[PDB]
Amino acid sequence: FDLNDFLEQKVLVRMEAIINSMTMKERAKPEIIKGSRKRRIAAGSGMQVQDVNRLLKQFDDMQRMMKKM
RNA sequence: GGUGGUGUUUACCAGGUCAGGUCCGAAAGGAAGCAGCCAAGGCACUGCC
Helix, strand or coil: CCCCHHHHCCCCHHHHHHHCCCCHHHHHCHHHCCHHHHHHHHHHCCCCHHHHHHHHHHHHHHHHCHHHC
């Protein structure tokens, strides 16, 4: 379950904008989205790092389950 | 090296365009711009000079 699937799932429209700002490598192996990338991803999706961190946290939640069922 | 070709590679770090999103604006409309793409660079093979 990579960020590519979690994408299929201005309310959420912005939660998309964020991913539509990532790169294939990022959307495929999130454990590489440190500071620098974030600062890119945020300003890229007109958001803010905190926003990204939010979505990042969301993915994890929606992720762990897959790895537990 | 120059200038071509082909394969490969490259998140941001004053190239271009810009979905999506953001920004300013009562509006009309402006602005910056991620991914993508183009271009460009790198690693090689290669033609020519």
